[PDB]
Amino acid sequence: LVKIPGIIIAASAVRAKATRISIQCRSCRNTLTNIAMRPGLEGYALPRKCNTDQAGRPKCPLDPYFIMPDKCKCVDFQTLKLQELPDAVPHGEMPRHMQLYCDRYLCDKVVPGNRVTIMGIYSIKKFGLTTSRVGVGIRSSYI
C-alpha cells in the first residue's frame, strides 16, 4: 500500500469490468455462474472443459464455455494518468508518470488537472504472461 502525490493529466471514459461472470457450455447449455473476477488489471482464463458429466451421453467439446453477458456483475472502471507533481520533479529531469486504476466510486472523483494524493496497491498487470524485444521480465506497473 503506497501513498503518492501527483497531478492527473488524463481520465479515461468510465467502462464496465465484471466482478462476477457466468459462462455457459455450448452443447449441454449448463452454466458455471458467479465466477469471481480478480480486481484490477487482471484477466481470466475460461475453463477448457465442461463440469457436467453423463457417462451414457457423449462429452461436451474442448472449449465449450461462452460468457453470458446479461448474467454478469459489472462495476465502474476508470484508468487515470498521474504525472509527477511539477514542484517535485528534479531540476533537469523529465517527469515520471504512473497509471492508476479506479473502481466503482473512485471513478469520476477526479478530473485532469487535479492535484491528488493516491493510496493504492502498487501492482503489475496480470493478463497472462504473454505479449512478447529488449525488456524481459518487465510487466507494466500501475497503482
Binding site: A45, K126, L129, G135, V136, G137, I138
Partner: protein
C-alpha cells in the same frame, strides 16, 4: 548499499589470473564474485543477511576502454568499458527476480524461479495438479528487482571526422538505477550482450542481432 566496488587494477596486481579471466567470461566470474562477497560480508557482519542477501560487485578502472563505434561481434559476452552521453532513460521499472507463479487451475504457488536477463521463465507443470495450463505471476510472493534502460551515445566531441554518433542501450539493475540522467556523461562497464530475444527472425530483413550492455558499473564524469 548491497554493492561492492572492486578496482580492476588492485585485482590484477594481487591476482592476475582472475583479472585475466574476468573480461572473457564475466557472467560466470561476476556470479562467483557475488557469492564470495556475500560470504565475506556475512562473515564480517552476520546480521546483514536480512538486509540484502545479495552483494553486487562492480568492477572499476577496467583498462579495456572501447568507444561505442568500435564494438563488434568479437566483443560479445565480454566485459567492456565505454563512455558516452546518456540520451534517454526509462523510469525505474520493477522486473521479476524470484518469481512465484499461481497455478490458476488449483491455486498452488509454484516455487521461486530465478529470472534471467535472457528469457522469460515459463513454468512447465504444476507440481500438485500437473497441469501445463495457464499460470499467473503471484505478485505478492514474487520478489522484484529494479530495472532501467538507458540509451548512451558517443560524446559529440569524440565523434569527429564528420560522421554520426553511435548509441547503445544499457540495462541498469537494482543499484545502478537512477545513477544516470539524460545529459550525463558517464563511464559504462558492462557485458556486451547478444542473446536474449532480439535476433530479427521475422524475415523483416537480414538475420542481424540486437545488442545491449548489461551495465555492471557506472561512473559519472563530474562534481557531486
Amino acid at each position: 548499499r548491497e554493492s561492492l566496488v572492486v578496482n580492476y587494477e588492485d585485482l590484477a596486481a594481487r591476482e592476475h589470473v582472475l583479472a585475466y579471466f574476468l573480461p572473457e567470461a564475466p557472467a560466470e566470474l561476476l556470479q562467483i564474485f557475488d557469492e564470495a562477497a556475500l560470504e565475506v560480508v556475512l562473515a564480517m557482519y552476520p546480521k546483514y543477511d536480512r538486509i540484502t542477501n545479495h552483494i553486487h560487485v562492480r568492477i572499476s578502472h577496467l583498462p579495456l576502454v572501447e568507444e561505442l563505434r568500435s564494438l563488434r561481434q568479437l566483443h560479445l559476452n565480454q566485459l567492456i568499458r565505454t563512455s558516452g552521453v546518456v540520451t534517454s532513460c526509462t523510469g525505474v521499472l520493477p522486473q521479476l527476480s524470484m518469481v512465484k507463479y499461481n497455478c490458476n487451475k488449483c491455486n498452488f504457488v509454484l516455487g521461486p524461479f530465478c529470472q534471467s536477463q535472457n528469457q522469460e521463465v515459463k513454468p512447465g507443470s504444476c507440481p500438485e495438479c500437473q497441469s501445463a495450463g495457464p499460470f499467473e505471476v503471484n505478485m505478492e510472493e514474487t520478489i522484484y528487482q529494479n530495472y532501467q534502460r538507458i540509451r548512451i551515445q558517443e560524446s559529440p566531441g569524440k565523434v569527429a571526422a564528420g560522421r554520426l554518433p553511435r548509441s547503445k542501450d544499457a540495462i541498469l539493475l537494482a543499484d545502478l538505477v537512477d545513477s544516470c540522467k539524460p545529459g550525463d556523461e558517464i563511464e559504462l562497464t558492462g557485458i556486451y550482450h547478444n542473446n536474449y530475444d532480439g535476433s530479427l527472425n521475422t524475415a523483416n530483413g537480414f538475420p542481424v542481432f540486437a545488442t545491449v550492455i548489461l551495465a555492471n558499473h557506472v561512473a559519472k564524469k563530474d562534481n557531486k
